Amino acid sequence: AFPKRLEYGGHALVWSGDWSAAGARKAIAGAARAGYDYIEIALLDPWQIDVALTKDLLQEYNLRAHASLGLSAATDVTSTDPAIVAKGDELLRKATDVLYALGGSELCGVIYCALGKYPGPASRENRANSVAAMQRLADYAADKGINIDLEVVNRYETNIMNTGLEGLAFLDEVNRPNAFLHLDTYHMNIEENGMAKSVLAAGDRLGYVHIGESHRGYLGTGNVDFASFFAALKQIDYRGPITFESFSSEIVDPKLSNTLCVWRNLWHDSDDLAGKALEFIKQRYGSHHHHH
Amino acid sequence: AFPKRLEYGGHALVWSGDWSAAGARKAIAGAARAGYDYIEIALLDPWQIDVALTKDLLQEYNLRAHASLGLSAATDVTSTDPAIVAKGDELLRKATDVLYALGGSELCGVIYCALGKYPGPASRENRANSVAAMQRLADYAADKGINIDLEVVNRYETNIMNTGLEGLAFLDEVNRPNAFLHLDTYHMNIEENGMAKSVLAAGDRLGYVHIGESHRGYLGTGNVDFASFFAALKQIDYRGPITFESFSSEIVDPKLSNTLCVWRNLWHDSDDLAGKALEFIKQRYG
Ligand SMILES: O=C(CO)[C@@H](O)[C@H](O)[C@H](O)CO
Ligand SMILES: O=C(CO)[C@@H](O)[C@H](O)[C@H](O)CO
Numbered sequence: 351a352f353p354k355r356l357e358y359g360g361h362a363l364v365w366s367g368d369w370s371a372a373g374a375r376k377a378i379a380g381a382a383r384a385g386y387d388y389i390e391i392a393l394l395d396p397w398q399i400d401v402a403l404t405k406d407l408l409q410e411y412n413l414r415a416h417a418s419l420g421l422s423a424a425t426d427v428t429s430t431d432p433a434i435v436a437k438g439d440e441l442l443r444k445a446t447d448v449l450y451a452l453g454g455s456e457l458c459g460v461i462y463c464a465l466g467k468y469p470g471p472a473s474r475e476n477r478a479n480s481v482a483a484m485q486r487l488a489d490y491a492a493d494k495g496i497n498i499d500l501e502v503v504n505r506y507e508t509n510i511m512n513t514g515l516e517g518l519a520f521l522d523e524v525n526r527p528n529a530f531l532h533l534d535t536y537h538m539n540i541e542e543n544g545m546a547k548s549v550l551a552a553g554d555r556l557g558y559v560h561i562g563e564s565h566r567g568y569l570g571t572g573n574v575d576f577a578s579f580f581a582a583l584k585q586i587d588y589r590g591p592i593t594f595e596s597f598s599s600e601i602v603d604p605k606l607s608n609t610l611c612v613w614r615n616l617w618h619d620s621d622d623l624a625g626k627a628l629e630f631i632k633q634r635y636g637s638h639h640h641h642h
Numbered sequence: 643a644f645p646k647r648l649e650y651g652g653h654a655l656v657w658s659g660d661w662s663a664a665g666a667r668k669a670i671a672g673a674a675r676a677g678y679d680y681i682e683i684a685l686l687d688p689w690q691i692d693v694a695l696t697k698d699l700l701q702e703y704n705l706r707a708h709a710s711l712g713l714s715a716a717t718d719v720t721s722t723d724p725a726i727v728a729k730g731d732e733l734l735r736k737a738t739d740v741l742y743a744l745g746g747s748e749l750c751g752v753i754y755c756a757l758g759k760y761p762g763p764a765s766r767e768n769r770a771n772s773v774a775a776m777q778r779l780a781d782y783a784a785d786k787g788i789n790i791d792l793e794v795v796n797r798y799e800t801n802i803m804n805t806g807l808e809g810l811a812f813l814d815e816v817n818r819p820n821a822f823l824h825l826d827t828y829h830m831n832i833e834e835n836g837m838a839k840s841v842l843a844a845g846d847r848l849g850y851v852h853i854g855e856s857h858r859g860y861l862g863t864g865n866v867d868f869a870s871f872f873a874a875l876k877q878i879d880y881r882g883p884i885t886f887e888s889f890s891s892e893i894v895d896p897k898l899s900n901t902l903c904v905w906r907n908l909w910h911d912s913d914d915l916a917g918k919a920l921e922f923i924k925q926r927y928g
């Protein structure tokens with residue numbers, strides 16, 4: 351395991367649908383402006399990233415970076431097609447290389463399967479291929495001081511693991527020093543037996559957090575029991591990344607907005623949403639955790 | 643409109659993945675033994691139901707029936723192609739006919755679009771075609787003293803209506819007295835600003851309720867705020883069908899279970915789940 355610190359992230363996709371020169375600048379400037387410690391860069395296509403330009407921008411804004419992605423049907427490491435698993439391996443190595451180049455230490459999100467609605471349940475073949483892919487990725491990332499955090503998502507976005515407990519069982523199979531659970535309040539709201547159970551069960555194996563409202567709009571305008579979730583995080587003395595995310599159909603790649611089934615926009619202004627979200631998060635977890 | 647009474651139902655998929663002679667008996671006997679007033683039959687293929695056998699079982703067990711379904715790509719009444727809308731109209735008429743023969747008064751669920759993940763956002767044309775289809779369905783059902791209840795479901799299951807407010811707006815355009823809102827606590831848990839707003843807004847227009855936990859397993863073992871929901875039902879003095887709805891990966895209808903992404907075995911004992919669900923509901927809304 352590589353060091354984790356309590357730090358707050360803005361998801362790049364809150365501001366920008368791509369990583370063009372303008373997209374990269376807009377998103378980094380947005381996260382910085384809202385008072386975030388880091389930007390979570392979406393590496394769904396890590397060959398699109400101008401790494402030299404991106405590091406220049408991170409320096410310009412004195413902002414740190416972590417990365418998340420979801421695989422696609424063409425790169426699905428669950429695939430019963432060995433060539434597709436290998437294409438996933440290749441995409442994950444490239445994402446790791448980009449994250450490494452930017453001084454980042456966390457690769458998280460749906461890195462263990464294709465993000466989206468599977469037409470049927472996973473076989474132990476899908477599960478075995480995913481675990482082995484996450485072992486090869488963990489081993490590749492380990493030389494680069496990078497932790498991988500496997501994001502548990504709801505039934506409509508994966509068939510592999512939908513609860514923290516399923517995530518921990520999967521990680522028992524991965525059995526790598528730098529592999530962690532990643533929990534997301536939006537997904538937890540659907541799948542979990544309360545918001546505290548998987549956090550308390552995970553303890554030190556919780557490596558990454560996403561904050562989203564039940565409908566992925568403004569924090570506190572939906573059904574997520576944030577009070578319960580953040581009470582659990584405080585109990586385990588969680589000192590790692592916490593990213594705010596939401597997905598506007600006016601900003602994101604139609605590929606993603608259609609996969610996430612974003613049919614209505616709950617907000618217009620990236621800056622207002624992200625600023626209010628961090629205020630809300632720091633109200634729940636505190637300004638800081640520094641003790642004399 | 644045909645009267646609504648406070649009655650408690652169990653969804654067929656609590657007991658049975660099909661409506662074979664064996665599946666029908668198992669579901670109807672299960673609902674009767676748990677103490678439900680009615681079984682909610684999943685009529686995704688209303689041509690498959692042996693109506694004469696089902697009537698015999700309902701009478702044998704002294705159990706009433708309502709029906710729910712989802713349309714598919716083949717029957718999607720939001721389609722811009724009249725050939726697909728026509729097939730949807732036909733399936734909805736057949737479902738109404740089966741419900742009539744079984745003495746049921748409620749056709750509910752995702753009757754206004756294909757159940758599942760749309761590849762992109764709905765056009766005003768998709769919406770207008772669905773409204774017109776529900777006008778034709780309402781008119782057909784009205785002749786048979788059958789109410790239709792349009793079920794608001796989450797973003798991954800429709801692109802037409804994901805909130806009670808969107809539901810009420812759609813019904814304003816349908817403008818039929820036997821067309822009602824159908825709310826489901828599982829779907830509300832995702833899409834709604836709390837569990838009260840949509841219920842209070844709907845009032846007399848709320849015609850059918852589904853009680854589902856956040857993960858669709860045992861009631862009271864998830865994130866659904868049932869206290870706020872049932873408080874809102876009391877506020878509007880709701881007297882209508884209340885169905886317990888639950889899905890496990892070990893009781894499967896190959897279409898419906900996969901469409902709903904039921905990946906987990908959240909229960910194995912149907913009788914235990916259904917008995918405890920009915921007690922849970924009656925404790926909160928006797
Ligand atoms: O929760 C989600 C998707 O519902 C995002 O965090 C997603 O996993 C993606 O990896 C972000 O880049
Ligand atoms: O909530 C749902 C779908 O998520 C059910 O009400 C569905 O319409 C019914 O199972 C059809 O039989």
Ligand SMILES: OC[C@@]1(O)OC[C@@H](O)[C@@H](O)[C@@H]1O
Nearest residue numbers: 356357358387636637638639
């Ligand atoms: O608790 C984390 C935090 O508030 O600690 C003090 C500063 O390092 C901040 O940038 C940081 O977000």
Ligand SMILES: [Mg+2]
Nearest residue numbers: 619621622623
């Ligand atoms: Mg502003």
Ligand SMILES: [Mg+2]
Nearest residue numbers: 573865866867
């Ligand atoms: Mg809740």
Ligand SMILES: [Mn+2]
Nearest residue numbers: 501534560595
């Ligand atoms: Mn997330």
Ligand SMILES: [Mn+2]
Nearest residue numbers: 793826852887
């Ligand atoms: Mn339902």
